[PDB]
Amino acid sequence: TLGNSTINSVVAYGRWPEYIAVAACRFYTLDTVTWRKESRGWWWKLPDALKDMGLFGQNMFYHYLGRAGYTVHVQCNASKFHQGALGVFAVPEMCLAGDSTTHMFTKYENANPGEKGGEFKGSFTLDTNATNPARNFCPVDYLFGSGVLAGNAFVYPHQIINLRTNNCATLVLPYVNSLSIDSMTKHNNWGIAILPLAPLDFATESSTEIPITLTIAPMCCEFNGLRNITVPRTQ
Amino acid sequence: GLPVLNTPGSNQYLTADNYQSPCAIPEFDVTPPIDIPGEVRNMMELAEIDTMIPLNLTNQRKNTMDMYRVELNDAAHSDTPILCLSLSPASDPRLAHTMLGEILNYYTHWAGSLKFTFLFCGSMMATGKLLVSYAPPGAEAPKSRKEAMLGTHVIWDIGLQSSCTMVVPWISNTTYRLTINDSFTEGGYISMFYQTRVVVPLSTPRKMDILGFVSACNDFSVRLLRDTTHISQE
Amino acid sequence: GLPVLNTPGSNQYLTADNYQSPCAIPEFDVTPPIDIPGEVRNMMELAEIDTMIPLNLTNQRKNTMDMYRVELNDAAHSDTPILCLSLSPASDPRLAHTMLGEILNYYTHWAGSLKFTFLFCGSMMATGKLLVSYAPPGAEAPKSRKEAMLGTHVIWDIGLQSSCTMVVPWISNTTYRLTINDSFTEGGYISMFYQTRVVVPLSTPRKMDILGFVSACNDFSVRLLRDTTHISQE
Amino acid sequence: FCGSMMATGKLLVSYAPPGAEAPKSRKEAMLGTHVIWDIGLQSSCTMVVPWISNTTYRLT
Amino acid sequence: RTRSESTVESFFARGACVAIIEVDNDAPASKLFSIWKITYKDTVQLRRKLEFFTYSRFDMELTFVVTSNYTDANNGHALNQVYQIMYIPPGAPIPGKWNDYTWQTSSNPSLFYTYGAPPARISVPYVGIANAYSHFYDGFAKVPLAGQASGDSLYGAASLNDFGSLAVRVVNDHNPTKLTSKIRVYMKPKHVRVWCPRPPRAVPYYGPGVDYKDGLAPLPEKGLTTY
Numbered sequence: 001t002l003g004n005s006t007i008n009s010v011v012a013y014g015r016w017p018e019y020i021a022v023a024a025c026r027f028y029t030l031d032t033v034t035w036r037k038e039s040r041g042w043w044w045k046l047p048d049a050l051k052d053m054g055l056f057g058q059n060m061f062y063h064y065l066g067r068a069g070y071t072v073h074v075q076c077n078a079s080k081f082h083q084g085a086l087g088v089f090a091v092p093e094m095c096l097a098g099d100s101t102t103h104m105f106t107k108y109e110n111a112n113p114g115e116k117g118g119e120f121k122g123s124f125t126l127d128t129n130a131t132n133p134a135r136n137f138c139p140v141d142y143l144f145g146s147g148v149l150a151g152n153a154f155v156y157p158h159q160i161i162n163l164r165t166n167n168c169a170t171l172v173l174p175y176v177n178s179l180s181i182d183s184m185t186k187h188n189n190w191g192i193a194i195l196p197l198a199p200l201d202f203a204t205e206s207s208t209e210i211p212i213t214l215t216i217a218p219m220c221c222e223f224n225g226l227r228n229i230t231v232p233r234t235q
Numbered sequence: 236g237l238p239v240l241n242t243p244g245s246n247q248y249l250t251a252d253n254y255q256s257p258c259a260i261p262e263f264d265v266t267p268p269i270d271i272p273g274e275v276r277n278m279m280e281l282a283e284i285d286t287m288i289p290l291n292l293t294n295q296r297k298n299t300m301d302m303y304r305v306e307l308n309d310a311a312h313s314d315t316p317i318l319c320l321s322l323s324p325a326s327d328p329r330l331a332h333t334m335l336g337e338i339l340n341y342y343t344h345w346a347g348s349l350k351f352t353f354l355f356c357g358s359m360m361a362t363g364k365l366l367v368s369y370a371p372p373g374a375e376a377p378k379s380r381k382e383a384m385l386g387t388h389v390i391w392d393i394g395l396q397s398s399c400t401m402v403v404p405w406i407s408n409t410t411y412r413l414t415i416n417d418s419f420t421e422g423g424y425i426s427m428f429y430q431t432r433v434v435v436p437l438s439t440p441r442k443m444d445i446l447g448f449v450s451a452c453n454d455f456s457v458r459l460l461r462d463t464t465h466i467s468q469e
Numbered sequence: 470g471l472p473v474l475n476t477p478g479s480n481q482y483l484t485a486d487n488y489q490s491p492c493a494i495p496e497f498d499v500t501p502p503i504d505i506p507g508e509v510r511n512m513m514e515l516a517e518i519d520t521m522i523p524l525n526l527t528n529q530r531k532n533t534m535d536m537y538r539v540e541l542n543d544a545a546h547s548d549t550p551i552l553c554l555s556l557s558p559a560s561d562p563r564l565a566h567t568m569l570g571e572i573l574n575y576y577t578h579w580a581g582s583l584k585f586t587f588l589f590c591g592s593m594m595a596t597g598k599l600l601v602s603y604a605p606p607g608a609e610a611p612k613s614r615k616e617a618m619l620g621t622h623v624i625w626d627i628g629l630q631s632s633c634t635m636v637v638p639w640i641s642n643t644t645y646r647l648t649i650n651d652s653f654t655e656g657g658y659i660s661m662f663y664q665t666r667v668v669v670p671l672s673t674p675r676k677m678d679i680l681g682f683v684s685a686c687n688d689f690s691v692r693l694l695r696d697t698t699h700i701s702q703e
Numbered sequence: 704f705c706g707s708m709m710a711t712g713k714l715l716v717s718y719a720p721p722g723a724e725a726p727k728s729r730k731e732a733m734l735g736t737h738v739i740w741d742i743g744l745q746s747s748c749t750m751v752v753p754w755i756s757n758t759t760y761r762l763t
Numbered sequence: 764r765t766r767s768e769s770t771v772e773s774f775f776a777r778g779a780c781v782a783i784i785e786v787d788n789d790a791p792a793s794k795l796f797s798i799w800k801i802t803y804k805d806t807v808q809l810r811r812k813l814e815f816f817t818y819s820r821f822d823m824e825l826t827f828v829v830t831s832n833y834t835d836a837n838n839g840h841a842l843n844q845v846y847q848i849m850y851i852p853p854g855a856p857i858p859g860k861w862n863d864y865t866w867q868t869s870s871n872p873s874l875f876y877t878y879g880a881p882p883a884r885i886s887v888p889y890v891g892i893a894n895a896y897s898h899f900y901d902g903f904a905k906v907p908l909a910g911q912a913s914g915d916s917l918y919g920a921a922s923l924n925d926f927g928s929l930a931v932r933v934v935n936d937h938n939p940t941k942l943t944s945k946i947r948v949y950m951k952p953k954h955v956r957v958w959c960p961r962p963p964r965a966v967p968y969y970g971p972g973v974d975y976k977d978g979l980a981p982l983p984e985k986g987l988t989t990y
């Protein structure tokens with residue numbers, strides 16, 4: 001229980017979140033995504049995904065500096081006759097490859113999608129529109145979206161949701177950064193990547209879909225540098 | 236001044252030397268470190284992390300996610316192997332690009348035990364027993380469960396538990412093996428077989444996937460740092 | 470003689486080295502020092518001295534004395550800013566050429582609090598209240614007293630006292646800021662507003678001047694000595 | 704929950720103190736007090752609504 | 764069997780080439796001085812080794828190997844050359860000509876190397892403005908604000924890895940004959956601490972970021988039931 005919100009667990013690097021506001025930092029439920037047979041994966045950025053969550057987003061945009069750990073709870077239930085496996089990875093500094101011949105050309109509005117996040121692709125497509133480039137991420141699942149083999153992503157803090165065994169995953173991420181505190185609007189400290197390690201299947205049904213829900217609670221929150229409100233440009 | 240005599244090796248630059256040099260920014264006030272999570276002291280700590288094995292490197296599967304999945308079915312029992320692996324953790328293409336293999340490709344000599352974990356990703360209604368075997372080198376690679384049973388092995392009941400670990404203990408004539416394909420320092424064979432068949436009830440998927448992970452044990456060590464073949468510049 | 474081996478870096482001249490050399494005038498009888506007033510041990514001691522800010526760098530004012538004077542009047546209250554400053558003490562053209570800025574332009578990194586003093590130079594019969602605000606970076610620069618009031622600020626009563634100091638405390642994501650214009654190490658905004666208006670009786674000047682001074686606080690420090698851009702040779 | 708033993712699912716039960724518009728979606732409900740109920744784990748779930756009032760008593 | 768050679772110190776205890784700076788000694792198509800921005804991302808081997816981790820602290824040892832040659836046969840002889848390597852920290856004035864005043868290097872550290880001497884060498888401590896170096900930065904230097912026109916900074920680019928440049932020239936007045944020189948820069952991290960291990964790069968690098976363009980199919984073909 002954290003605040004008025006209530007409900008194996010993995011503590012990233014064995015380090016519980018710690019201090020170097022209090023009401024605002026509680027469990028928030030993002031929009032549900034649909035796991036299909038042909039799904040490739042999903043990603044979110046923290047604190048970006050929580051930027052429109054009650055008082056936590058207000059504190060994000062009213063302060064120059066902020067820091068927080070997180071507790072991420074992935075929820076996905078199915079029957080005993082379903083099969084499939086998900087890998088949930090927490091990546092510090094989760095930089096994703098772009099889609100253009102120009103290096104680092106992804107624009108701010110696409111790098112910070114919010115609680116909807118983005119999806120991995122099965123292959124790499126190069127954006128050719130030069131007059132109006134998309135300037136979006138093109139994260140390939142087997143390259144883990146950053147030019148590394150997804151099979152080695154298990155070096156990151158992670159959990160596995162095997163449908164025959166468990167239906168939930170819990171990751172406790174401490175604040176990780178080269179600084180004690182940073183700008184929450186400039187920098188995403190954590191990334192969450194969910195990849196289907198084993199494809200979803202249900203007997204004699206090429207139609208089954210099951211929901212995945214993420215609930216994220218910021219922890220050990222600190223804010224500093226109160227000023228007027230930041231209003232980032234949107235697309 | 237003091238009489239001195241210049242020995243051979245004077246004025247050479249050895250890139251592996253350990254010498255003092257003058258500081259180009261004296262009296263710099265260095266930023267103190269903070270307690271960042273996830274500090275690493277030894278590269279072996281990374282080799283001791285389980286990473287998924289790209290076992291299914293077929294023409295249509297390599298360089299996709301399908302290369303990580305090995306398919307089982309509920310067909311009748313057979314003695315044909317499910318998977319066959321060479322115990323060459325740095326030169327076998329299926330182990331070379333795991334975290335363990337990537338670390339090994341920066342060194343010339345390796346020794347120590349290995350850990351292979353297998354995760355069954357079928358329905359909860361599926362049952363079956365599998366045999367996982369390691370054969371030390373020297374004989375022909377086992378092609379049936381009869382030959383595989385003679386080596387080290389474990390029996391995995393998926394119904395009882397969804398993940399099973401087999402430790403391959405260090406057994407070598409030499410004190411270290413080379414990180415390349417070499418007959419004199421060959422490692423052996425890892426094989427998987429059906430002990431019984433996989434059984435499912437009705438209204439259940441009849442095909443399912445297993446996944447493989449490999450890591451090093453606490454007795455693992457490497458020697459003779461060297462450049463890798465996994466990165467090149469054009 | 471003694472066996473020696475010449476390591477790399479031999480025979481180089483590093484202008485920042487610290488080595489001994491032979492004395493070209495041995496046995497010189499050096500004149501002893503006297504107790505001269507005004508000795509300095511640290512360049513930061515010079516950066517801790519208040520110097521006047523050339524705030525009014527307009528076309529007709531720059532490179533004259535008028536660039537140091539900011540004019541107030543007794544007009545009706547408004548929320549328009551009186552002055553706007555970027556907290557870039559080495560790269561903002563209004564702070565770069567103060568003593569603090571001149572010292573900062575010999576270094577690459579700076580950290581610590583700043584002190585801004587404002588002196589009101591009207592008649593003794595003038596009254597008024599002003600608002601002086603610092604907004605940390607990240608948001609749009611405040612364009613009205615409503616936005617400025619949300620940041621750090623002080624209220625200055627000129628009738629009560631003719632000089633008022635606002636300390637801008639050190640607030641940064643990084644441990645040091647760069648002495649150039651850089652977005653990642655931006656400092657924030659300093660702004661001045663009318664809290665009430667300036668009121669004068671009859672037979673009194675209706676326009677007057679304020680002056681600005683800046684200095685560093687005792688927690689200030691700099692790093693990585695470098696050449697300045699404020700002097701050049703042709 | 705009175706379904707079959709083969710049924711699974713997670714439900715969200717929320718209490719919102721008064722003052723704002725009544726929540727019409729899970730996004731608004733999640734901001735108040737709430738609990739997550741896993742029917743597969745347990746068939747009965749209790750949410751305590753704690754006493755939160757401006758007045759010392761409410762009228763019936 | 765100890766793990767002495769797999770410690771983080773031993774893993775990085777090598778001088779790795781990171782740059783080849785080319786200069787010419789000629790009368791003023793030539794380049795009488797060169798500016799190299801200090802980075803380890805011009806090469807691949809050291810970059811891949813470092814990007815096993817997210818954060819790092821270390822001192823740096825720089826070694827300079829200088830080679831030179833005549834451009835034309837029997838065109839004449841030359842006297843031994845002296846090279847100046849001046850560190851220009853960010854903000855210091857940048858040379859614009861071979862003979863401009865900036866080379867006086869009153870406050871910039873400078874190194875004078877005589878050709879034929881053993882490679883030059885200096886050391887610097889950990890100079891990061893943050894508590895550690897960032898190999899990866901998932902953010903922007905500027906947040907674009909509503910009202911701003913079409914805060915457009917590049918993704919991942921931040922001044923936390925801005926360390927200045929090296930300006931390299933030949934101090935000698937120009938010979939009657941043209942000479943070409945190359946200075947190879949070798950980096951060795953020392954007293955290394957690292958944090959947050961990452962999977963190693965699997966496809967060719969493309970730019971200073973993590974973008975990929977080519978060679979996306981690294982793994983070969985291998986039968987499932989073949990040893």
Ligand SMILES: CCCCCCCCCCCCC/C=C/[C@H](O)[C@H](N)CO
Nearest residue numbers: 259823850872873874885887896897926
């Ligand atoms: C006087 C001759 C020149 C000697 C001075 C050399 C330049 C001073 C060192 C600047 C470079 C700092 C070390 C660089 C560290 C790496 O780039 C970081 N890992 C970046 O993430």
